[PDB]
Design a protein around this ligand. Structure first.
Ligand SMILES: *[C@@H]1O[C@H](CO)[C@@H](O[C@@H]2O[C@H](CO)[C@@H](O[C@@H]3O[C@H](CO[C@H]4O[C@H](CO[C@H]5O[C@H](CO)[C@@H](O)[C@H](O)[C@@H]5O[C@H]5O[C@H](CO)[C@@H](O)[C@H](O)[C@@H]5O)[C@@H](O)[C@H](O[C@H]5O[C@H](CO)[C@@H](O)[C@H](O)[C@@H]5O)[C@@H]4O)[C@@H](O)[C@H](O[C@H]4O[C@H](CO)[C@@H](O)[C@H](O)[C@@H]4O[C@H]4O[C@H](CO)[C@@H](O)[C@H](O)[C@@H]4O[C@H]4O[C@H](CO)[C@@H](O)[C@H](O)[C@@H]4O)[C@@H]3O)[C@H](O)[C@H]2NC(C)=O)[C@H](O)[C@H]1NC(C)=O
Ligand SMILES: *[C@@H]1O[C@H](CO)[C@@H](O[C@@H]2O[C@H](CO)[C@@H](O[C@@H]3O[C@H](CO[C@H]4O[C@H](CO[C@H]5O[C@H](CO)[C@@H](O)[C@H](O)[C@@H]5O[C@H]5O[C@H](CO)[C@@H](O)[C@H](O)[C@@H]5O)[C@@H](O)[C@H](O)[C@@H]4O)[C@@H](O)[C@H](O[C@H]4O[C@H](CO)[C@@H](O)[C@H](O)[C@@H]4O[C@H]4O[C@H](CO)[C@@H](O)[C@H](O)[C@@H]4O[C@H]4O[C@H](CO)[C@@H](O)[C@H](O)[C@@H]4O)[C@@H]3O)[C@H](O)[C@H]2NC(C)=O)[C@H](O)[C@H]1NC(C)=O
Ligand SMILES: *[C@@H]1O[C@H](CO)[C@@H](O[C@@H]2O[C@H](CO)[C@@H](O[C@@H]3O[C@H](CO[C@H]4O[C@H](CO)[C@@H](O)[C@H](O)[C@@H]4O)[C@@H](O)[C@H](O[C@H]4O[C@H](CO)[C@@H](O)[C@H](O)[C@@H]4O[C@H]4O[C@H](CO)[C@@H](O)[C@H](O)[C@@H]4O)[C@@H]3O)[C@H](O)[C@H]2NC(C)=O)[C@H](O)[C@H]1NC(C)=O
Ligand SMILES: *[C@@H]1O[C@H](CO)[C@@H](O[C@@H]2O[C@H](CO)[C@@H](O[C@@H]3O[C@H](CO[C@H]4O[C@H](CO)[C@@H](O)[C@H](O)[C@@H]4O)[C@@H](O)[C@H](O[C@H]4O[C@H](CO)[C@@H](O)[C@H](O)[C@@H]4O[C@H]4O[C@H](CO)[C@@H](O)[C@H](O)[C@@H]4O)[C@@H]3O)[C@H](O)[C@H]2NC(C)=O)[C@H](O)[C@H]1NC(C)=O
Ligand SMILES: *[C@@H]1O[C@H](CO)[C@@H](O[C@@H]2O[C@H](CO)[C@@H](O[C@@H]3O[C@H](CO)[C@@H](O)[C@H](O)[C@@H]3O)[C@H](O)[C@H]2NC(C)=O)[C@H](O)[C@H]1NC(C)=O
Ligand SMILES: COc1cnc(-n2cnc(C)n2)c2[nH]cc(C(=O)C(=O)N3CCN(C(=O)c4ccccc4)CC3)c12
Ligand SMILES: *[C@@H]1O[C@H](CO)[C@@H](O)[C@H](O)[C@H]1NC(C)=O
Ligand SMILES: *[C@@H]1O[C@H](CO)[C@@H](O)[C@H](O)[C@H]1NC(C)=O
Ligand SMILES: *[C@@H]1O[C@H](CO)[C@@H](O)[C@H](O)[C@H]1NC(C)=O
Ligand SMILES: *[C@@H]1O[C@H](CO)[C@@H](O)[C@H](O)[C@H]1NC(C)=O
Ligand SMILES: *[C@@H]1O[C@H](CO)[C@@H](O)[C@H](O)[C@H]1NC(C)=O
Ligand SMILES: *[C@@H]1O[C@H](CO)[C@@H](O)[C@H](O)[C@H]1NC(C)=O
Ligand SMILES: *[C@@H]1O[C@H](CO)[C@@H](O)[C@H](O)[C@H]1NC(C)=O
Ligand SMILES: *[C@@H]1O[C@H](CO)[C@@H](O)[C@H](O)[C@H]1NC(C)=O
Ligand SMILES: *[C@@H]1O[C@H](CO)[C@@H](O)[C@H](O)[C@H]1NC(C)=O
Ligand SMILES: *[C@@H]1O[C@H](CO)[C@@H](O)[C@H](O)[C@H]1NC(C)=O
Ligand SMILES: *[C@@H]1O[C@H](CO)[C@@H](O)[C@H](O)[C@H]1NC(C)=O
Ligand SMILES: *[C@@H]1O[C@H](CO)[C@@H](O)[C@H](O)[C@H]1NC(C)=O
Ligand SMILES: *[C@@H]1O[C@H](CO)[C@@H](O)[C@H](O)[C@H]1NC(C)=O
Ligand SMILES: *[C@@H]1O[C@H](CO)[C@@H](O)[C@H](O)[C@H]1NC(C)=O
Lengths: 107, 30, 125, 440, 130, 128, 119, 130
């Protein structure tokens, strides 16, 4: 039904550098129904941000999200080695749920 | 009255009588 | 303040909005256990009504059930058209949908009311 | 072009926690006898109720997170404390009681020295003390009252009446109560027929230990409700479609006499029994217990993997956990419940009325484990009380059969059966929508 | 806390059927929870299959008529269990699978919206190749 | 506030300007205590607040909003009363009238609410 | 009540008034209860006055009462251009009761006249 | 309480200079209080010479350039002190003098308005003739 794309598709970064990964949707998600994931290699994805910019419990505060119409972004300041992996972007607005193309960040 | 050993924040080790949970019997407390 | 008619969509409930106000009246010196609870309960109600009426008053509706405000609709707050907003979405669903833009809506309403007040004095000279 | 429009009175709500006051029935006080529950203070008298059936709305209910039960526990603990604050302290009588020692009665006649009204003089008094209250300290051996090392005892004031009467919990304006209205409502889950109710149905504040009495029966079937059907440390509450009747009496009439222990203070002591010495008992019909027990076994079979269900007598503990405990008319009783709860279903069918022995006690301790306690004064007339049992509380044994033992008392579990269907939800009146009008 | 465990791995051939069952330690009941079935891909993004929500089974439009979903909640000895069955197995089914849950007790949290919700707690996963 | 209540409705209607004028107080001093006198003031404050809030709540729903003379477009049904304007406003006091028509206050309130909400709905239609 | 802009002349601050706004017994618990009643009580009092004069929720309310020079003697420019609000309210603090009464009487007189027009 | 004391009488001649100092007892600080200088000619009405308010000095246009006003606050050993010095003395300067103090803690009392005030307490006097 709806489609979503995430860029940059592959990224390189060092420790202490801010990361700007963006998400785009074909339609306008005005209800701010977007979620972010971060899976370590060979591991199941874990929810990090829901409803645009809401943090879960027991999660580092460096992860931050911004939501404005079509452009959804997630900012990771002061990166560590534990936070590398694959990130995802999903819509919970319309049936069926859809997932982002998939982006990887490497040393 | 406290029966405290004298010349014997120092302590002056003391002896006094006290009321047990039973209203009649009494004990000695150091 | 009504409970009941919560299941129905906006088009059904709004007609009976009149009824919500219509049918009904609508809307201690003791230190015992029950007496203190009664004191707290009385304060809670008065305080709640006044907060609600204070919020309503600043926009200049002044104690009226449907209030028209001259504030244009921003497409960032919502996208759906009048038919698909008022024909298949309940009030709870809508208020959950647009719960991220209530503060901005309130601020815009207050600023618009103040601007309209200023524009009135000029006409009177 | 749509324009912002504002509505007052839209149908929206969110969950909440509030102070819910007490409302009671028209009869003031309790026919002019003061109660421990202070129903007379709490009488914003109940007007005719209004209930609105919410239609096409589904709500989610969890009964183990309700704050309504938590408020009640605190209010009841407090109402008892305010009642016993003016009453006499029984601290003079924590002295060595020399009692004659050695079918058998529990009386143990005793002699002790007590303070008179004038401070200088003393008197020797004799009283009949139940064996349950008195603990041996190591003919004519010495003894002492049970709560002499952990508690201060305060006599109940004689006139206050422990007669449980209905208390309705009501909600302040701007808040509402919602009732599930669904048959066989398991307590926890999605509920389809919600109704908006202004005040709770009357709940009798009755505290009991192994069998729930004078409660409200369930609508369609026996229902087992528990917090985690997997844990062995969580009690299982059973609710019954139909009631079984238990009648309890203390047959032998006694006398009360009062001794003056201070200026203005009177301790009432039990007196010799006129008439024939007789033992208290409670009568439960044999056929009725067995039919209802049989149905509980089937329901326990469904949620427990179809194994055989073995019911066994309670293992151990303070007198309350081991024996059924209730207050008949100002007199707390602790009846033996083995005949009732000894069987294997999966089935004794004996139909003769079952009589269970009861032993009364007079020093009652707070269930919380706090230091304080109370003494209940003697009741002169013979006492008879008739009651209906609408539930059982059972707790599972440690891991082809599952053994369930009778359960003890946390005051809260008594009322969870009663308040399983209510939720307090706050009503948020304002709303904003897009309409076509446009003019300030 | 919350912890999910599924079955083991299987290696099979086309024209068969296989089922994976998740056992949740921490979900009091599925009445106020929901199970979402999501299938990861060998190198691609994750996909959606179906769900059980208020004991109302459903599936995506690309898996209708093939995949079946069932669940049983708390018992005397076992925790809640939900299961997925793949019928008419094919080469395209060579991927990991996950069983996921999100809480539905409060409408106003933001983890669900009209039955289409997030994925809060994820299982370990079971690789299935054919 | 009550005063000059013996005059007829017509005589006391032109003196309503005096009743409204000249501040139509005590217990405003903060105490923050729990003595015998400290609680009675605390309850008196709440009594006054609830009474005024209830009265203004009833007034607002009919479209009066703080005006002494509130005109409404609700026709007079003869079942509530027979007597004419002269017999009502010339030889009858306010207590007499409010005791005469004490069986039809709830219906009057309800009808006023119906009229106000229906008039409110009509306007939205005109604006569109 | 916006403190801040309290040292500015009346004309400047007036422009910048864009937005107006937005049990247990223990030592603390009683204090909290007293604090609540104090606020509710205060809000109601200003509202009671405003409404009697007919203002009813308007931050700036125009009234028909004329200005008598025995209250003030200065011109519009002197009053607005160089007097701060705490200075003016102290300068006319002897004629607030009479002003309140005059506005109440004028509002009642206007209220009575309208009924005559409606017949 | 409040009490003011000044210097004694002096008999000078034209071309000289004299100083009168008033010491205030009971005035906590000159920051809260204000000091005003008034001269009364014999028979004729009282006149205003100068003031120190919030540590800023000023004098009337007629007396400007010939009068100096200085003040010092509390010292363990002394009360707050204020002083006036006449300069370039002339025959017209023959008069009693007074030093006065008015409370200015709160702006809603009416004693002071914008630096112009009603002097609550008046000192005794220091007659100076030439
Ligand atoms: C809490 O903490 C606070 C902060 O720490 C603290 O606040 C400070 O408190 C102290 C006191 O403890 C204050 O200090 C005092 O301030 C007084 C005010 O001085 C002002 O005014 C004079 C005079 O102003 C006129 O003249 C100048 C120069 O000609 C003009 O420029 C003015 O415009 C003005 O002219 C107009 O007015 C005339 C009438 O007076 C008209 O004729 C004229 O036409 C005009 O209309 C100024 O000179 C002062 O200026 C000073 O600062 C500027 C920079 O801004 C400098 O350039 C300048 O040189 C000055 O330094 C100021 O504007 C002072 O008068 C007072 O001074 C006395 O004490 C100091 C020591 O501290 C001495 O050194 C000094 O000599 C003074 O002593 C005289 O007076 C005492 C009084 O009894 C005598 O006992 C003593 O013997 C001496 O008298 C002798 O000398 C006289 C000549 O000076 C002579 O006439 C006598 O006859 C005699 O011979 C003192 O410094 C300070 O201001 C506060 N600061 C602040 C920010 O608040 C507070 O106290 C603390 N609280 C507590 C409780 O502790
Ligand atoms: C408190 O009190 C409340 C009130 O009583 C209580 O609430 C009750 O809880 C019950 C659970 O305890 C609950 O009962 C369960 O309900 C489940 C839902 O059933 C519905 O859906 C199924 C499936 O629907 C599919 O398929 C049908 C037919 O094909 C189709 O018509 C549908 O449209 C739908 O298709 C859609 O989806 C498909 C994919 O899923 C898709 O392919 C289609 O195209 C289409 O899009 C229906 O069949 C039902 O009729 C219902 O409509 C139900 O699944 C579950 O059944 C299981 O348990 C039964 C015993 O109770 C068994 O008899 C049954 O066989 C099931 O057991 C299977 O699953 C378990 C799970 O592990 C497994 O262990 C078993 O071995 C067995 O698996 C084997 O068989 C399956 C095939 O069935 C194979 O796939 C496996 O591989 C195995 O071989 C329960 O019946 C009840 O509804 C609920 N009541 C209410 C009113 O809410 C609450 O529980 C209490 N709480 C506590 C703590 O006690
Ligand atoms: C009602 O009451 C019952 C009984 O109390 C309760 O069931 C029990 O719940 C607890 C959770 O609270 C369960 O404990 C978890 O069990 C899982 C599964 O273990 C299975 O396999 C082992 C080995 O075969 C068996 O021994 C076991 O019995 C189970 O069959 C464990 O994986 C969990 O391990 C976590 O705890 C460790 C400490 O013991 C920690 O080291 C760590 O946190 C473990 O989690 C970690 O695992 C990940 C790897 O998978 C790792 O990467 C992460 O870092 C993660 O932190 C845990 O022990 C217990 O098994 C349940 N028992 C039964 C019989 O059901 C219900 O939950 C309760 N219901 C409610 C609603 O409260
Ligand atoms: C901080 O604390 C200090 C120390 O406590 C305090 O200082 C003292 O303040 C008091 C006032 O509270 C001062 O008492 C007054 O002093 C004046 C000046 O006296 C001087 O001269 C005499 C005689 O030469 C000396 O003995 C003395 O030491 C001083 O040098 C007196 O004139 C006052 O007299 C009044 O009191 C008489 C009783 O003693 C009464 O008969 C009468 O009320 C006097 O007032 C009368 O005087 C008028 C004539 O001028 C007359 O016409 C009126 O009728 C009027 O009634 C009084 O004794 C004391 O001297 C201060 N001492 C010091 C060392 O400073 C500060 O005030 C305090 N600060 C604050 C802010 O509180
Ligand atoms: C739309 O509105 C909702 C609710 O008003 C917003 O959700 C809220 O987002 C904030 C973001 O700061 C959350 O605060 C954070 O909460 C976590 C919880 O652990 C805490 O650790 C952080 O320090 C921080 O306080 C807040 O919890 C969250 N509310 C809920 C109920 O989840 C949402 O962000 C809004 N949408 C957008 C796009 O901003
Ligand atoms: C009787 O227990 C207290 C004893 N004493 C006090 N005291 C108050 N002031 C002082 C000095 N003590 C108490 N306060 C609260 C108390 C309680 O609520 C409390 O635990 N239960 C009251 C209700 N119930 C019984 O009826 C009971 C019923 C069937 C069988 C056995 C006992 C359970 C226990 C309390
Ligand atoms: C949002 O509104 C635009 C019109 O500007 C429309 O093209 C688009 O389809 C809308 N999106 C949705 C999801 O309705
Ligand atoms: C609500 O919207 C859907 C799709 O936008 C539409 O199919 C449905 O008919 C609408 N509801 C009603 C009651 O018309
Ligand atoms: C009780 O008091 C009497 C005093 O009359 C005394 O003789 C007696 O010994 C006391 N009892 C005991 C056990 O000491
Ligand atoms: C207990 O018995 C007597 C009563 O006969 C009592 O007075 C005395 O204190 C005790 N005597 C002993 C030691 O048996
Ligand atoms: C809910 O209960 C009411 C009255 O008990 C009943 O009329 C209604 O049919 C019930 N709802 C359903 C879905 O059966
Ligand atoms: C519970 O009692 C009702 C009638 O009171 C009866 O119809 C029902 O069958 C009983 N429950 C069971 C499980 O038999
Ligand atoms: C039982 O004993 C009490 C107390 O002495 C007495 O009042 C009552 O009459 C007795 N009853 C009978 C039947 O004897
Ligand atoms: C209990 O009393 C009731 C009414 O008095 C009676 O019907 C019932 O049979 C009694 N119980 C037994 C077991 O006889
Ligand atoms: C059981 O006894 C209670 C006591 O009041 C009564 O209300 C209830 O109706 C009785 N139950 C039956 C089925 O008669
Ligand atoms: C009187 O007329 C009104 C219409 O204004 C109507 O609502 C009311 O029911 C009538 N009274 C009776 C008793 O019918
Ligand atoms: C009141 O009515 C009576 C009718 O008998 C009339 O005579 C009288 O004059 C009326 N009152 C006044 C003040 O006119
Ligand atoms: C000024 O006018 C007011 C009313 O307009 C009046 O009350 C006041 O007495 C007048 N002042 C003088 C001095 O006439
Ligand atoms: C003050 O009022 C008087 C008359 O009351 C008038 O002559 C004078 O001009 C006024 N002041 C000013 C500055 O106009
Ligand atoms: C107001 O008056 C003061 C002194 O009278 C003067 O300094 C100031 O410049 C005046 N205001 C304006 C705007 O000129």
């Amino acid at each position: 039904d709806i489609q979503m794309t995430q860029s940059p598709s592959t990224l390189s970064a060092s420790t202490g550098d801010t990361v700007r990964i963006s998400c785009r949707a074909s339609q306008s998600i005005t209800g701010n129904w977007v979620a972010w994931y971060q899976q370590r290699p060979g591991k199941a994805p874990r929810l990090l941000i829901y409803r645009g910019a809401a943090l879960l419990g027991g999660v580092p505060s460096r992860f931050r999200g911004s939501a404005a119409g079509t452009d959804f972004t997630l900012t990771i300041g002061n990166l560590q080695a534990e936070d590398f992996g694959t990130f995802y972007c999903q819509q919970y607005d319309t049936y069926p749920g859809t997932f982002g193309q998939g982006t990887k960040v490497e040393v | 009255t406290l029966n405290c050993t004298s010349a014997t924040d120092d302590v002056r080790n003391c002896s006094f009588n006290m009321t047990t949970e039973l209203r009649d019997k009494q004990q000695k407390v150091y | 303040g009504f409970l009941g008619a919560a299941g129905s969509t906006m088009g059904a409930a709004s007609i009976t909005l009149t009824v919500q106000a219509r049918q009904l009246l609508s809307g201690l010196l003791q230190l015992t256990v029950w007496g203190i609870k009664q004191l707290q309960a009385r304060v809670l109600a008065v305080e709640r009504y006044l907060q609600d009426q204070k919020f309503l008053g600043l926009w200049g509706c002044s104690g009226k059930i449907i209030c028209c405000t001259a504030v244009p609709w921003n497409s960032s707050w919502s996208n759906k058209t009048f038919e698909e907003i008022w024909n298949n979405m309940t009030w709870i669903e809508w208020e959950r949908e647009i719960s991220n833009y209530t503060s901005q809506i309130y601020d815009i309403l207050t600023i618009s009311q103040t601007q309209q007040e200023k524009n009135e004095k000029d006409l009177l000279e | 072009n749509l324009w912002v429009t504002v509505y007052y009175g839209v149908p929206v709500w969110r969950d909440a926690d509030t102070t819910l006051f007490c409302a009671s029935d028209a009869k003031a006080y309790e026919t002019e006898v003061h109660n421990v529950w202070a129903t007379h203070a709490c009488v914003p008298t109940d007007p005719n109720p209004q209930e609105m059936h919410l239609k096409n709305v589904t709500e989610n209910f969890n009964m183990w997170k309700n704050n309504m039960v938590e408020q009640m526990h605190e209010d009841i603990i407090s109402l008892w404390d305010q009642s016993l604050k003016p009453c006499v302290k029984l601290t003079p009588l924590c002295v060595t009681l020399n009692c004659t020692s050695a079918i058998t009665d529990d009386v143990r006649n005793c002699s002790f020295n007590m303070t008179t009204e004038l401070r200088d003089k003393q008197q020797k008094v004799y009283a009949l003390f139940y064996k349950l209250d008195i603990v041996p300290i190591d003919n004519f051996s010495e003894y002492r009252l049970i709560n002499c090392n952990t508690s201060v005892i305060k006599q109940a004031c004689p006139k206050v009446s422990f007669d449980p009467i209905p208390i309705h919990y009501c909600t302040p304006a701007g808040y509402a109560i919602l009732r599930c209205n669904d048959k066989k409502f398991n307590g926890t889950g999605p509920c389809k027929n919600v109704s908006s109710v202004q005040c709770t149905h009357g709940i009798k504040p009755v505290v009991s230990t192994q069998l729930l009495l004078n409660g409200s029966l369930a609508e369609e079937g026996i229902i087992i409700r528990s917090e985690n059907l997997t844990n062995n440390a969580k009690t299982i509450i059973v609710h019954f479609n139909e009631s079984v009747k238990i009648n309890c009496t203390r047959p032998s009439n006694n006398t009360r006499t009062g001794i003056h222990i201070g200026p203005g203070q009177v301790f009432y002591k039990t007196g010799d029994i006129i008439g024939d010495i007789r033992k208290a008992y409670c009568n439960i019909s044999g056929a009725q217990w067995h039919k209802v027990l049989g149905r509980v076994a089937n329901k326990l079979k469904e949620h427990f993997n179809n194994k055989t269900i073995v019911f066994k007598p309670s293992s151990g503990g303070d007198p309350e956990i081991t024996m059924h405990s209730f207050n008949c008319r100002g007199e707390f009783f602790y009846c033996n419940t083995t005949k009732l709860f000894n069987s294997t279903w999966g089935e004794t069918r004996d139909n003769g009325t079952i009589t269970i022995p009861c032993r009364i006690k007079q020093i009652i301790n707070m269930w919380q484990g706090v230091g304080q306690a109370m003494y209940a004064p003697p009741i002169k007339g013979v006492i008879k009380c008739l009651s209906n049992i609408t539930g059982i509380l059972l707790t599972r044994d440690g891991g082809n059969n599952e053994t369930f033992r009778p359960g003890g008392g946390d005051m809260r579990d008594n009322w969870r059966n009663e308040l399983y269907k209510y939720k307090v939800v706050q009503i948020e009146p304002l709303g904003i929508a897009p309409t076509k009008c446009k003019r300030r | 806390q919350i912890h999910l465990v599924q079955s083991g791995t299987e290696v099979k051939k086309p024209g068969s059927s296989v089922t994976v069952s998740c056992k949740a330690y921490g979900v009091n009941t599925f009445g106020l929870y929901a199970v979402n079935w999501v299938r990861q891909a060998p190198g691609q993004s994750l996909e959606y299959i179906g769900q059980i929500w208020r004991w109302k089974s459903s599936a995506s439009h690309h898996f209708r008529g093939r995949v079946l979903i069932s669940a049983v909640d708390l018992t005397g000895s076992s925790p809640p269990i939900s299961s997925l069955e793949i019928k008419n197995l094919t080469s395209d089914d060579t991927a990991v699978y996950f069983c996921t849950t999100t809480s539905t007790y409060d409408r106003w949290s933001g983890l669900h919206h009209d039955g289409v919700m997030a994925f809060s707690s994820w299982g370990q996963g079971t690789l299935i190749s054919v």
